[PDB]
Amino acid sequence: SFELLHAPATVCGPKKSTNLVKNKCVNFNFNGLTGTGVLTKSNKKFLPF
């Protein structure tokens, strides 16, 4: 017996991967954010959050 109340589908299920690439034009999905472009390593300092 499933159900979809007001709040989310939490229980939900598994999302998978693929491979990085880097230095090549690649279509793009990164945990939700989609795009297209060369993805080289950076030099930024994102806060751990």
């Binding site: 109340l5 007001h6 709040a7 989310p8 939490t10 806060l47 959050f49």
Partner: peptide, 28 residues
């Protein structure tokens, strides 16, 4: 100035319309 970094997100669904502490206690 000191900003407040996130610490959780409890994905509950209760409707809160009151509150209280359980024992200095400044509240805004």
């Amino acid at each position: 100035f000191s900003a407040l970094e996130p610490l959780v997100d409890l994905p509950i669904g209760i409707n809160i319309t009151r509150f209280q502490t359980l024992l200095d206690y400044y509240v805004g």
